[PDB]
Design a protein around this ligand. Structure first.
Ligand SMILES: [Mg+2]
Ligand SMILES: [Mg+2]
Ligand SMILES: [Mg+2]
Ligand SMILES: [Mg+2]
Ligand SMILES: [Mg+2]
Ligand SMILES: [Mg+2]
Ligand SMILES: [Mg+2]
Ligand SMILES: [Mg+2]
Ligand SMILES: [Mg+2]
Ligand SMILES: [Mg+2]
Ligand SMILES: [Mg+2]
Ligand SMILES: [Mg+2]
Ligand SMILES: [Mg+2]
Ligand SMILES: [Mg+2]
Ligand SMILES: [Mg+2]
Ligand SMILES: [Mg+2]
Ligand SMILES: [Mg+2]
Ligand SMILES: [Mg+2]
Ligand SMILES: [Mg+2]
Ligand SMILES: [Mg+2]
Ligand SMILES: [Mg+2]
Ligand SMILES: [Mg+2]
Ligand SMILES: [Mg+2]
Ligand SMILES: [Mg+2]
Ligand SMILES: [Mg+2]
Ligand SMILES: [Mg+2]
Ligand SMILES: [Mg+2]
Ligand SMILES: [Mg+2]
Ligand SMILES: [Mg+2]
Ligand SMILES: [Mg+2]
Ligand SMILES: [Mg+2]
Ligand SMILES: [Mg+2]
Ligand SMILES: [Mg+2]
Ligand SMILES: [Mg+2]
Ligand SMILES: [Mg+2]
Ligand SMILES: [Mg+2]
Ligand SMILES: [Mg+2]
Ligand SMILES: [Mg+2]
Ligand SMILES: [Mg+2]
Ligand SMILES: [Mg+2]
Ligand SMILES: [Mg+2]
Ligand SMILES: [Mg+2]
Ligand SMILES: [Mg+2]
Ligand SMILES: [Mg+2]
Ligand SMILES: [Mg+2]
Ligand SMILES: [Mg+2]
Ligand SMILES: [Mg+2]
Ligand SMILES: [Mg+2]
Ligand SMILES: [Mg+2]
Ligand SMILES: [Mg+2]
Ligand SMILES: [Mg+2]
Ligand SMILES: [Mg+2]
Ligand SMILES: [Mg+2]
Ligand SMILES: [Mg+2]
Ligand SMILES: [Mg+2]
Ligand SMILES: [Mg+2]
Ligand SMILES: [Mg+2]
Ligand SMILES: [Mg+2]
Ligand SMILES: [Zn+2]
Lengths: 157, 68, 105, 208
RNA sequence: GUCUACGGCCAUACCACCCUGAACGCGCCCGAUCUCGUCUGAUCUCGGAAGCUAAGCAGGGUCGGGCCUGGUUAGUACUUGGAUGGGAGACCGCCUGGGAAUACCGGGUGCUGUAGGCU
RNA sequence: GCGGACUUAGCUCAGUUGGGAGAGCGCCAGACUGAAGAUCUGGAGGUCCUGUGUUCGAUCCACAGAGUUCGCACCA
RNA sequence: UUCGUUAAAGA
RNA sequence: GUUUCCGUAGUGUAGUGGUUAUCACGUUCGCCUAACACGCGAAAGGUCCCCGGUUCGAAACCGGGCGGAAACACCA
RNA sequence: GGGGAGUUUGACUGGGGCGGUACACCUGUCAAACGGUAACGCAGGUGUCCUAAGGCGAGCUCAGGGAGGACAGAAACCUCCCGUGGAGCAGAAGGGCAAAAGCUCGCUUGAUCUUGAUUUUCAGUACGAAUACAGACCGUGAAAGCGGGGCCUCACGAUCCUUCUGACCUUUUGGGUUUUAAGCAGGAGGUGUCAGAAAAGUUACCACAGGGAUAACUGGCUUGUGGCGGCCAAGCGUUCAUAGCGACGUCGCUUUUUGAUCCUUCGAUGUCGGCUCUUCCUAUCAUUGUGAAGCAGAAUUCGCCAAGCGUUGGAUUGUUC
RNA sequence: CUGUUUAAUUAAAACAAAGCAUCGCGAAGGCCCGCGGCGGGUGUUGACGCGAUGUGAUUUCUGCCCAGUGCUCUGAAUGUCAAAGUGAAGAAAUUCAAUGAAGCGCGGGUAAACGGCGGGAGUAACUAUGACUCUCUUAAGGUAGCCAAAUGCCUCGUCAU
RNA sequence: AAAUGGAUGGCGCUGGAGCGUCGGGCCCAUACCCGGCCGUCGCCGGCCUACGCCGCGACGAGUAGGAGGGCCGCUGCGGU
RNA sequence: UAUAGGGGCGAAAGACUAAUCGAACCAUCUAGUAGCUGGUUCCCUCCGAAGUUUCCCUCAGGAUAGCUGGCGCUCUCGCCCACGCAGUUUUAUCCGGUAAAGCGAAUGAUUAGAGGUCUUGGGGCCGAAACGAUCUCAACCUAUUCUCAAACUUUAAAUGGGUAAGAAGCCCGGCUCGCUGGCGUGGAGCCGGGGUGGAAUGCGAGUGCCUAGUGGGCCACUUUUGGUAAGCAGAACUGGC
């Protein structure tokens, strides 16, 4: 009964936020959208030709097809039944890269360099990403000044 | 005789009765939905790969087996 | 709305943009001894009354004004149809307008 | 006139007078200053303000009756132009009425469930100031008694506080007499202008 | 230390006012016969180069307005989860975690790629 | 959807053997007029519902469209 | 062919 | 309470198929009578209920109030 | 041609009908910062309009404000400056747009034909709408490119039948020619109850299968409304607030009225009033014991303990009243 | 008025009734029955008869409207109008054109046929009520009578008994 | 201040058997741990009805409904 | 004796027509249909719901999807290292526009005081009148100040959503292309080779067929819509009946 048409809840989401109204920058176009690139979706208000849908905003997908002045992305969308991989045709202006895969490739390159150094010098490296360890038995310093005594203040309106 | 209209109560529990599934298995991804000019590239490229790849790859395999 | 007299549109016989005379589509008189007409006459002849249902509750007030496009060039004679959305008023081919014209009425 | 026993604490979103209502009648209160409206800042040193405690809704008719009672006690106590009272609270929340019996079960049912605008109340947060009275130093008890007479009339529980500030300004009375004379604060009618140091030099040349 | 042509970041780079500009360059400027389009060579095109940094432009400044950033506001308003907590209600307090913004004050105000020329 | 009729000067109508226009009710100026009524004479107001072809020339010829009425069975 | 009415006395 | 309709000179009303201030009564001036009625020649009187939107242009088409007018409020 | 026959009387609904369409499609909120998410929730719209208000290219910048200029005034025309969207984009709103998607000018119909894929609703079915492509013929532009309708969000329709278009198409039944008929592919003639039946009313003479999924009694929650109290006191009370009153505001009780819901009852709980009869409550009319008055006496008013005992005879109306 | 009626909840103000009316029909007919025949009822009957209705003794009255829905009359002067028939095109199916029976439309009559009967404003030397007057208006605007009626929401209308 | 007589459950309770802060003990549910028995499932053993015999461990509630077993039962038929 | 069932008869009540009449009685079609009441017969064991999406002249019903059971199949463990999954956390990377806050910031409202003097309107003064001059008021501007907005917002939480955390990955060498094109240029596909120790915790997983019931729900913490409120009507998460 909410009149389920296209973009019935997009008063804010497909809007340019503040001090950004105008022509689109050209570095949005001048990007390398090859196949297999993990990209993100963020709709634009200026270009009304290729915004995907209000349901795919903020999602993350994989490129399968590239054309003249758009791109094709497969996106895992959740519905009532189960999540499904869906094929969308989105223009270039709505799409940016995802730096998480780039950070993972940087970690893979650093691990390969550490493994090359390990095979060279015979030194074990422990290249697994361990989480935040518990704090070691470290040592504090209280020289010069006594610890400052804190007391709670009285109530004043 | 007014009835209850619409609800999504007791729905996520029915979703998780059977463990909502990723498709999770697509090796050698499907090819339909891709640019027909790119397909006119790729099919002719594949059949000429099937035709004319013998002698140069054979001599390259012999050369890399001799050099390694 | 307003459509012009002539229009250069792709005709399927020769395969080029040729000019087309544009006329209004008439539905035309229904031919007797068609298949459903003979079936309805055979079904109606007899004490059965109105056998097939007749439509009553009409609510649309307009019709899709479609255009008959004829090839202007000789020995082609290609005729086909173009569909436009529903319109109430329809000018045939005349009375083009201007922007700087005064209103004298 | 329905009681305030039924129109009560905040249970709905604020529904103000706007393009979408277009059916609200006129509010009960129209004015908000009653004492010396053109009073200077140095005329009345102190002020007492009425702090709420319950997250409630105060009606414009209750604000009317309270400001009439406080004005009457001030003109009985310190006479005309010996006080300045300001109702800090402004009514914007428009309540709705669903009236019936326009005496049988045959007018309507719960068919049309949305109501018509009856009156205007004001949503009050905890700690929000209802009224503020600025007077002389010797009129400390009269402000307390006037806000007590308003306390007997407003619903719920609320307290009184004599402010540390100098009247309606946001600056302290302890630093006011020390700091209006040297550099910064300049009197502007009943208000006080605070100059920063991030000004053009022509303002400092026009001053001093 | 700079400019010109094309730019990327889109006000740290806009707006108002006041100073400086040596060499190329950028421009204001000098005229309609051809290309040109207008009521008007005002705008756009055609071959310039007599003067000029007055203007654009490029730098500096304004206890400048805005912008960005940092304290204060503030562990405050809020908020995931909990109680056989309080209160008649209104709401409030606590355990566990996350944690915002305006007034107020302080600092800055262009960084660079390609190609080319002047000290 | 057929067949047929009215589409005309402020209003009501006439007008094909196709050769440019009328009658009355309305307006103005005149004729007798104690005041009116009535009568008589002369003018303005018609690109004939519109468009397309025949004719030297469509108000009446032929087709289509746009408002009104008239009888008919009304298979999405 | 249409064309109504003019108080009261006071000679 | 619900659904429709109306509001125009002092009075009753017409009027847009967007581009008037319309008809009669009422008031006033003159002629006619000796003088009133009546008749004739004329003039004045409009916020087209109030406020906005559409359009070059609204009272006119539409939206919200104001004051009235019609129909229903039935089964227990 | 209701003389007679057969059939129908849409659905939602704080019971049904009346009222409305929340029955089909859009905007914002509800909506709790992914998305989805209800009601007869709210504020609104739509069944159209455009051969230009489509497409391209070029030029210009809007609404408003200030200053000036003969008639010129509040608005007639010209010029200068400020002017970030305060204008316009056909229309209800939201988003978006400045050498622009706004205004003007010049050409043009890409609003053309055809095969797939995807998004939206979603069951991942259809329709409508839309997206990125691909193949022809093209329009504009110097080219870049843009364009297969409207800057985007809606503006529209199944089977069967009818009609039109196309191949120098197939079948027209033993074989040929011609006419006709059928088919193939795509445009139209609609189901607004909008995924689509062809449809008036009454039954107090009614009947059947059922429902307390569903009203008219009581009872249950609530107390708007009715009634009964309290709080501060501007004033009435000749003077004087509180002897008695009390506005403007505000806090409570009751089911003795009415309203709201449908929780029980539809294989029945007999529906008003009166007569008669028993019990209970106090928010006390009188009686017993008291306090206060603007209580001199008498007669009244306000309160407390207090339901033990009384609380009529009648004319009218079926009466409750 | 006497009479009759809901046997088994009504006895009536209900029905019937004489009186007053209206319409159809001159027998190859009016109104009806029947599946059928020139078969039947009225009919062994003939406008003082039969058939179909309204109202309901006597007295006094029977107002005004054919705009609407009905009923009836007239004319191929005239629009529409189906089968059949006529002419033409073709090889034929088929198509076209004119000719046009009833009915409808065009005109009239009929309301003791169904039915219907208006709302504002200004007006009299105390004031009100208002003879009278202007305009819109339909087909006609409730006439003679009667009344809060068995008919009146306000209503327990106002006065009298 | 409300209608039959009635409700911290009643009885009762005031140096508490009321109120708020708490200390140590005490009572039990089909909850937990250990153990005995039945059944299901999983893994498995053996060349002792193989459709039988053991071994280990974790688990058993449930309307509508769906399966597996019955050396539960009734009537009749052929072998026995 | 005559009138016999959609018929008769009726001084008219739809009354009477064999105790039945607003359409008699008997038999047959007929065991008429019913989305509608009631009922549905032995035990034990195992698993075990829903009152929801969409469509229907649909609202007491059905279809479809979801929830569920049964039947299997493909594999994996038991002998310094596997494959894979998660109503979960961690490390990185995006998304939003609610709570809050603000309006001396745009839009819409809204209070009060001050300063300035352009403009018109209304009073008073110098006096023929005179923007010749003066005071106040009205409107305007500037800096302030009060209170807000579900259909306002510069800013902007908590909670949450998507993605990556490797042998399907990284690098090297070489062919093909009718795609593209200054270029052996770019991009896709194909072939050969190299090294697996790539966040935590827990778990053995993938897949095919058939189908019943379900499609009347309710309550509670928290967030909320209408109503004065309800043991009222309607939504979101989670849990329970
Ligand atoms: Mg349901
Ligand atoms: Mg047949
Ligand atoms: Mg026949
Ligand atoms: Mg020239
Ligand atoms: Mg020239
Ligand atoms: Mg020049
Ligand atoms: Mg200079
Ligand atoms: Mg310069
Ligand atoms: Mg600078
Ligand atoms: Mg600054
Ligand atoms: Mg909490
Ligand atoms: Mg007279
Ligand atoms: Mg019938
Ligand atoms: Mg219904
Ligand atoms: Mg959301
Ligand atoms: Mg959410
Ligand atoms: Mg342009
Ligand atoms: Mg400018
Ligand atoms: Mg718009
Ligand atoms: Mg193309
Ligand atoms: Mg439907
Ligand atoms: Mg019926
Ligand atoms: Mg009867
Ligand atoms: Mg009350
Ligand atoms: Mg119920
Ligand atoms: Mg009840
Ligand atoms: Mg319910
Ligand atoms: Mg009984
Ligand atoms: Mg009983
Ligand atoms: Mg007693
Ligand atoms: Mg009897
Ligand atoms: Mg007689
Ligand atoms: Mg008589
Ligand atoms: Mg009569
Ligand atoms: Mg014939
Ligand atoms: Mg007649
Ligand atoms: Mg009558
Ligand atoms: Mg009088
Ligand atoms: Mg009379
Ligand atoms: Mg007790
Ligand atoms: Mg104790
Ligand atoms: Mg079990
Ligand atoms: Mg029979
Ligand atoms: Mg029968
Ligand atoms: Mg009987
Ligand atoms: Mg019957
Ligand atoms: Mg029968
Ligand atoms: Mg049976
Ligand atoms: Mg349903
Ligand atoms: Mg199913
Ligand atoms: Mg399964
Ligand atoms: Mg299973
Ligand atoms: Mg939102
Ligand atoms: Mg808020
Ligand atoms: Mg079953
Ligand atoms: Mg059910
Ligand atoms: Mg509920
Ligand atoms: Mg439980
Ligand atoms: Zn052609």
């Amino acid at each position: 009964t909410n009149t389920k048409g296209k973009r019935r809840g997009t008063r804010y989401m497909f809007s340019r936020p503040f001090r950004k109204h105008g022509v689109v920058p050209l570095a949005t176009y001048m990007r390398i959208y090859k196949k297999g690139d993990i990209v993100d979706i963020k709709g634009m208000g200026t270009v009304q030709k290729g915004m995907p849908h209000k349901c795919y905003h903020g999602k993350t997908g994989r490129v399968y097809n590239v054309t003249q002045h758009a791109v094709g992305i497969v996106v895992n969308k959740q519905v009532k039944g189960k999540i499904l991989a869906k094929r969308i045709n989105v223009r270039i202006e709505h799409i940016k890269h995802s730096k998480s895969r780039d950070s993972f490739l940087k970690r893979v390159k650093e691990n390969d360099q550490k493994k090359k150094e390990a095979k060279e010098k015979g030194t074990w490296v422990q290249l697994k990403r361990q989480p935040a360890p518990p704090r070691e038995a470290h040592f504090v310093r209280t020289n010069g000044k006594e610890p400052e005594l804190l007391e709670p203040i009285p109530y004043e309106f | 005789a007014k009835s209850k209209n619409h609800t999504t109560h007791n729905q996520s529990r029915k979703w998780h009765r059977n463990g909502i599934k990723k498709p999770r298995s697509q090796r050698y991804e499907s090819l339909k939905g891709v640019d027909p000019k790119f397909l006119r590239n790729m099919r002719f490229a594949k059949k000429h790969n099937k035709k004319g790849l013998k002698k140069m790859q054979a001599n390259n395999a012999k050369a890399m087996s001799a050099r390694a | 709305v307003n459509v012009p007299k002539t229009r250069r549109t792709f005709c399927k016989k020769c395969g080029k943009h040729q000019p087309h005379k544009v006329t209004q589509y008439k539905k035309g008189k229904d031919s007797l001894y068609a298949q459903g007409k003979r079936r309805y006459d055979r079904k109606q002849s007899g004490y059965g009354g109105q056998t097939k249902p007749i439509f009553r509750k009409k609510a649309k007030t307009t019709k899709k004004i479609v255009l008959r496009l004829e090839c202007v060039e000789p020995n082609c004679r290609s005729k086909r149809m173009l569909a436009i959305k529903r319109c109430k008023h329809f000018e045939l081919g005349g009375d083009k307008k201007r922007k700087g014209q005064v209103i004298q009425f | 006139r329905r009681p305030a026993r039924c129109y009560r604490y905040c249970k709905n979103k604020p529904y103000p007078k706007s393009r979408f209502c277009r059916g609200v009648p006129d509010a009960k209160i129209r004015i908000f200053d009653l004492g010396r409206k053109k009073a200077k800042v140095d005329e009345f040193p102190l002020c007492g303000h009425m702090v709420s405690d319950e997250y409630e809704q105060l009606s414009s008719e209750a604000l009317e009756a309270a400001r009439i009672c406080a004005n009457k006690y001030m003109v009985k106590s310190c006479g005309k132009d010996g006080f300045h009272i300001r109702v800090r609270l402004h009514p914007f929340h428009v309540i709705r009425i669903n009236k019936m019996l326009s005496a049988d079960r045959l007018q309507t049912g719960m068919r049309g469930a949305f109501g018509k605008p009856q009156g205007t109340v004001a949503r009050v947060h905890i700690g929000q100031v209802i009224m503020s009275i600025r007077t002389k130093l010797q009129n400390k008890e009269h402000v307390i008694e006037a806000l007590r007479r308003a306390k007997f009339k407003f619903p719920g529980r609320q307290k009184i506080h004599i402010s540390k500030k100098w009247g309606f300004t946001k600056f302290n009375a302890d630093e006011f007499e020390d700091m209006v004379a040297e550099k910064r604060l300049i009197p502007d009618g009943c208000g006080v202008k605070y100059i920063p140091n991030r000004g053009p030099l022509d303002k400092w040349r026009a001053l001093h």
